[PDB]
Design a binder for this molecule. Structure first.
Ligand SMILES: [K+]
Ligand SMILES: [Mg+2]
Ligand SMILES: [Mg+2]
Ligand SMILES: [Mg+2]
Ligand SMILES: [Mg+2]
Ligand SMILES: [Mg+2]
Ligand SMILES: [Mg+2]
Ligand SMILES: [Mg+2]
Ligand SMILES: [Mg+2]
Ligand SMILES: [Mg+2]
Ligand SMILES: [Mg+2]
Ligand SMILES: [Mg+2]
Ligand SMILES: [Mg+2]
Ligand SMILES: [Mg+2]
Ligand SMILES: [Mg+2]
Ligand SMILES: [Mg+2]
Ligand SMILES: [Mg+2]
Ligand SMILES: [Mg+2]
Ligand SMILES: [Mg+2]
Ligand SMILES: [Mg+2]
Ligand SMILES: [Mg+2]
Ligand SMILES: [Mg+2]
Ligand SMILES: [Mg+2]
Ligand SMILES: [Mg+2]
Lengths: 144, 53, 130, 185, 25
RNA sequence: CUCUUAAGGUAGCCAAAUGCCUCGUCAUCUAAUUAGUGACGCGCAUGAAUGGAUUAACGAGAUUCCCACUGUCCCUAUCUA
RNA sequence: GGAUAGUGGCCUACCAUGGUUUCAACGGGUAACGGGGAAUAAGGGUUCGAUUCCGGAGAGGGAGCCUGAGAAACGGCUACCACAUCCAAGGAAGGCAGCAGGCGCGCAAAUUACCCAAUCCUAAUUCAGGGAGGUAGUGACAAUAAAUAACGAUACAUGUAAUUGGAAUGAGUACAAUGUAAAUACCUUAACGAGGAACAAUUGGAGGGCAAGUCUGGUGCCAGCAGCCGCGGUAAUUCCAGCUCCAAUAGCGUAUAUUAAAGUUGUUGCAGUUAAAAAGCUCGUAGUUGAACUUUGGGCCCGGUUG
RNA sequence: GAAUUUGGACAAACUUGGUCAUUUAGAGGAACUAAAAGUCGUAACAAGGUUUCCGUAGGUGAACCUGCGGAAGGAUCAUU
C-alpha cells in the first residue's frame, strides 16, 4: 500500500484524484482558467501594437544601477497601459513621445526579467521600422 | 535622469572597417576549418587552442 | 476614406504607370546619402475630377494626376523620380505661415491614440497646417 | 481541394547543440568527405537512426516470424544493394552495428574520388556539381547519390563535360579564340 | 511579525471589514 | 519637548432632531437642489444605562426620491341639492 | 385519436405518479463542431486538430413558406429585428462564413489575373456551362537537393604569403526546340556570361550553462550588457567598437503556446517526522478491497510442430 | 375561382416586468507588492538580554505586551 488505490475497479477514483491534483500545476491551471486572456494584457499573444505616452527612467534593482530608459505604451488592441523596455545600447533616441511601437514579451512569460522592476514587455518595432535595424545604421525612422 | 542615451556609443572614438580578404564561404570554409584544426598545424598549445595571446 | 488622401501632383518629364517602381523624394532629402527616399511603388494613377475619380493607366509629361498607393510614407510634398542623380525640385515657398497656434487635448483620455493619429492625418491633408 | 503533398524532414539537430566531442567528430567527417556543412552529417545520422529504429523493432519481433523475415531480408537487401552493408553480414545485427562512415563512403562524392577521377574530395565535389561525372547515360551533378555498387563500375565522365567527351569547353573555347588573335590573325 | 500577531491583526482587519460592510447596505 | 488634570473623550457616531462658521467639502440625486442620501471630520458645543452604536417588525410620528393617480396648477368651465 | 413518409407525449383528451441522480443527475463554463489524424515521442503518456478526407450545422439574427424527389434554400420568397444602396421624395432593391477585391479589427494572412487542356458535376445532354477545378502572380508558413570555388607551377616553411598559369561550371541573358490552351518557369541548349573569380553569406556569440580572447582603444555602477548566475564604481576576458575566433548556415535570431526534459501529476512512477503535505479523535453510507476450499495424478494410443 | 374574411396552430418581433451571467464608473475606506540608502523603536536569530512557538481573549504608536491551556521545533534526553 502506497497511499493510492490499486484495485482493478478503481480507475474512476484514480482519474478523479488526478483531476483534483492537477489543479496544483501553475501551467495547467493557467491554461484551463484562461488567465492569459483576462489578465496578462496581451490577449494570449506574443505581439501587439501600442502608442507611447511617456519616456521614463527606471532605476534597476539592487545591487545594480544605470536606469533602463523605458517607455509607457497605450495598447491599441484593448486599451491597457504597459511599460516596455527599449533593448539596445541607448536606442531611446529612436522612439519618441506619442509614437507607435510594437511590443513583444520580455523573455520570462511575464515574470519581469533581470534587474528591471515591473517591466514585462520590450519594443520590437517603432513607427513601423525595426528597432534593431534602426539602432544599426541600416535603416532610418520615417519623419513624424 | 534621461538624455544620456549616447554616453559611450555615440561620443567615443569610432574605428571604421578594414579592407580584408574574403573568407572562402561554404565547403571551402569547412576545409579551412579542417586544416586549421585537425592536421596538427602549430596552434595546439598542449591539447587544443584556437586564439593567440 | 480615412488615410489614403490621393496624391495630387504634376508630371514634368517621363511617364507614370500603374505599378511603376518610383523613388519618392523628401523635402529635406539630400541626394548624396541615405535620406527620405523610400523603395515603394505606385498602385493606381488617377485623373482627378469633380468629387469623383477616374482611374488612368498612363499620362505623358506636363499633366496633372492623382496617385493611389502613396502618402503613407511621405508627409507633405516632394517629387517622384526614377533616375539615380535626380535632384528634387524647389520647396514651393508660399506667402503664408503658421502663426495661429492653439493647444489640442482630447477630453476622453482613453481615446488618445485616435487624437495622435488625427494630428498626423491633418498635417498631410492641408499643406500649410503645422 | 487537391490531396495534400506529403513531405517529411530528412535531418534532426542534436539534443545538445555544443558538445565538444560531437562537434569534433562532425568536423572530422566533413573535412574527410568534403561536405558543405553539418547538415549532411545530420541527415545521414537521422536516416541511419531510422534504420536502427526499424532494425530494433524487427529484432524485438520474434525470430522466423514472417513479418521479421520479410522486413529484415528487405532491409539487408537494400543495404547490400546500396553498398553500405557488406555481403557477409546478412543477419540484421550488423545493420544495427552500422556507422556513419559506412553510409558516407557510398556518396558519389566519395566514389568518384576513390576511383581516381579527382585529385581531392573537394575537387571531386566541384567536378560533380559542374556536371562532369555521368553514371550511365545520365549526368549526375550532385554529391550524394548512394551508388548501388553496380554504378561503381560505370562511374565515368560524360560525353558532355569536356574531360571525357567531344566539346572543348567554354573558357577553353574563348582561350582558343583569343590565341587566334594573339597569333596575329 | 509573529504569525500569531499577523493573524490577530488580520482578524481585527476582518472585523473592521465586517463593520463597514454592515454599514453599507 | 514642554505647560497642565481627578481623569484629559476609550469603543463607537456625526454638518446627525446635536456644527456657529455653513447654503462646510467631495460624490450621487435634478436641467437647475439652503432639500434628501452616502462619505470626511481639531467635533462652536458628538459619545457610551445623564446610556453609545446597530436594529427585523410596528407607527393617523418628521424628512427625501420614484411609479401610478389625479383640476394642486397651466386655466379655468359646467351640473346638482 | 390527429399529424407525419411512417415509429414515438411528435401533438391532443382521460388515467396513475412517475422519470434522473455522489456509478455526479440537474446547473455553470468552453478562446468546444466531432472523427479519421498531428506535434512530442523507451514504455506509459501529454497537448493540438477553425483549415486538403468523412459526418454535422449555418448562410447578418430568429421565425414562416410555395415550387420542388430532395430546402425550412438564402448568388428563393414573406415579415419582424439591426444595418444599408438609390431617389426626380412619389418608390424600388438587399444579403461575399463563393472567387478576387475593399474597410474595420488586428500579431496575423495573396491577384478586383488566365482557362475549361487535366479531374470530375449538371442537361434535353459527345458539343454548353462550372471563380468546382487547374494554370500563372504574391510566398524565407513549412518541406527536398545543395552555388559562393577546384588544380597546377613558383617562393618559403603537410601547410602560408596582393608570386603567377592553364582548365571547369552555373547566377545569369537568350535565338530556336521542348514545356503549355497561348503561356512563364523547370530540364537540353548556338552565342554572350570569372580573377580582389566586387558574380564579395548571413544570423547570433567568445565568464559559466555552451564552442570560441585574461588582444587593443573607448566607458568609468554612466552608457549599457545579461533567458539564470551575474558584468560595469579608471586593469571590464561580459558594455561600445576594431582585430581575431566560435556555432548554424541561405538561413539564424527574438516573443508567445505546447511537448520531451517532468520520477516537478507519478497507472507504470512522486512525496507527506524535520524541506509542502496524515484529517484532533472515533463511527459510518457511497466507493474500493476482502481467508482457504470442489478433477488431481496416473497408463495407453492417433497424432502433430522443432534437430 | 383573385381581393376580402371566421376560427385555429406555427410563431418572428415589441413593451413592461422579473431573474441570471459578463464587463464597467464611483466620493470615500481598507489591503498587498515593488523601490527604498526616509522617521520611530528593537520584536526574532546567543538564555537575543522577559526562552521561543501554537490556539484563544484583551490591551498598546509600532514592532508587540499580558492572562489561560498546550508544544520543544529548549536553554533539560540525566536523581533507584
Ligand atoms: K553592480
Ligand atoms: Mg475619538
Ligand atoms: Mg459633527
Ligand atoms: Mg449626512
Ligand atoms: Mg423637492
Ligand atoms: Mg449628552
Ligand atoms: Mg399511438
Ligand atoms: Mg464554437
Ligand atoms: Mg476539439
Ligand atoms: Mg472538427
Ligand atoms: Mg473559434
Ligand atoms: Mg457577413
Ligand atoms: Mg449568398
Ligand atoms: Mg557572393
Ligand atoms: Mg568553454
Ligand atoms: Mg567584443
Ligand atoms: Mg516533487
Ligand atoms: Mg513541513
Ligand atoms: Mg480469494
Ligand atoms: Mg529584542
Ligand atoms: Mg520576546
Ligand atoms: Mg526574547
Ligand atoms: Mg531588549
Ligand atoms: Mg518549520
Amino acid at each position: 500500500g502506497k497511499g493510492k488505490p490499486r484495485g482493478l475497479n478503481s480507475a474512476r477514483k484514480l482519474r478523479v484524484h488526478r483531476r483534483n491534483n492537477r489543479w496544483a500545476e501553475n501551467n495547467y491551471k493557467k491554461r484551463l482558467l484562461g488567465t492569459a486572456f483576462k489578465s496578462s494584457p496581451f490577449g494570449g499573444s506574443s505581439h501587439a501594437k501600442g502608442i507611447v505616452l511617456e519616456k521614463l527612467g527606471i532605476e534597476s534593482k539592487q545591487p545594480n544601477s544605470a536606469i533602463r530608459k523605458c517607455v509607457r505604451v497605450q495598447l491599441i488592441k484593448n486599451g491597457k497601459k504597459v511599460t516596455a523596455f527599449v533593448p539596445n545600447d541607448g536606442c531611446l533616441n529612436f522612439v519618441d513621445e506619442n509614437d507607435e511601437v510594437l511590443l513583444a514579451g520580455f523573455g520570462r512569460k511575464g515574470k519581469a526579467k533581470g534587474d528591471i522592476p515591473g517591466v514585462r514587455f520590450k519594443v520590437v518595432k517603432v513607427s513601423g521600422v525595426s528597432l534593431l535595424a534602426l539602432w544599426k545604421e541600416k535603416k532610418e525612422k520615417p519623419r513624424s | 535622469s534621461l538624455a544620456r542615451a549616447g554616453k559611450v556609443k555615440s561620443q567615443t572614438p569610432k574605428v571604421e572597417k578594414t579592407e580584408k580578404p574574403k573568407k572562402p564561404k561554404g565547403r571551402a570554409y569547412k576545409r579551412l576549418l579542417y586544416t586549421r584544426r585537425f592536421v596538427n598545424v602549430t596552434l595546439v598549445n598542449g591539447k587544443r587552442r584556437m586564439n593567440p595571446g | 476614406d480615412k488615410g489614403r488622401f490621393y496624391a495630387f501632383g504634376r508630371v514634368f518629364a517621363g511617364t507614370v504607370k500603374s505599378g511603376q517602381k518610383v523613388r519618392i523624394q523628401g523635402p529635406n532629402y539630400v541626394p548624396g546619402k541615405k535620406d527620405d527616399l523610400f523603395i515603394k511603388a505606385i498602385q493606381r494613377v488617377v485623373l482627378m475630377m469633380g468629387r469623383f475619380v477616374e482611374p488612368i493607366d498612363d499620362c505623358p509629361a506636363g499633366n496633372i494626376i492623382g496617385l493611389v498607393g502613396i502618402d503613407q510614407f511621405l508627409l507633405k510634398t516632394g517629387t517622384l523620380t526614377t533616375s539615380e542623380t535626380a535632384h528634387n525640385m524647389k520647396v514651393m515657398k508660399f506667402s503664408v505661415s503658421p502663426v495661429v497656434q492653439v493647444a489640442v487635448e482630447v477630453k476622453n483620455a482613453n481615446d488618445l491614440p485616435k487624437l495622435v493619429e488625427g494630428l498626423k492625418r491633418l498635417s498631410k491633408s492641408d499643406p500649410c497646417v503645422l | 481541394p487537391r490531396a495534400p503533398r506529403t513531405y517529411s524532414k530528412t535531418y534532426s539537430t542534436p539534443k545538445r547543440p555544443y558538445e565538444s566531442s560531437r562537434l569534433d567528430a562532425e568536423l572530422k567527417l566533413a573535412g574527410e568527405f568534403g561536405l558543405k556543412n553539418k547538415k549532411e552529417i545530420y541527415r545521414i545520422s537521422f536516416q541511419l537512426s531510422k534504420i536502427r529504429r526499424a532494425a530494433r523493432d524487427l529484432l524485438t519481433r520474434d525470430e522466423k516470424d514472417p513479418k521479421r523475415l520479410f522486413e529484415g531480408n528487405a532491409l539487408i537487401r537494400r543495404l547490400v544493394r546500396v553498398g553500405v552493408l557488406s555481403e557477409d553480414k546478412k543477419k540484421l545485427d550488423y545493420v544495427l552495428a552500422l556507422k556513419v562512415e559506412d553510409f558516407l563512403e557510398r556518396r558519389l562524392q566519395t566514389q568518384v574520388y576513390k576511383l581516381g577521377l579527382a585529385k581531392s574530395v573537394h575537387h571531386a565535389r566541384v567536378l560533380i556539381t559542374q556536371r562532369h561525372i555521368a553514371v550511365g547515360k545520365q549526368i549526375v551533378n550532385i554529391p550524394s547519390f548512394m551508388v548501388r555498387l553496380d554504378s561503381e563500375k560505370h562511374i565515368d565522365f560524360a560525353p558532355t563535360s569536356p574531360f571525357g567527351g567531344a566539346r572543348p569547353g567554354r573558357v577553353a573555347r574563348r582561350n582558343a579564340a583569343r590565341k587566334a588573335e594573339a597569333s596575329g590573325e | 511579525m509573529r504569525a500569531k500577531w499577523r493573524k490577530k491583526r488580520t482578524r481585527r482587519l476582518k472585523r473592521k471589514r465586517r463593520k463597514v460592510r454592515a454599514r453599507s447596505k
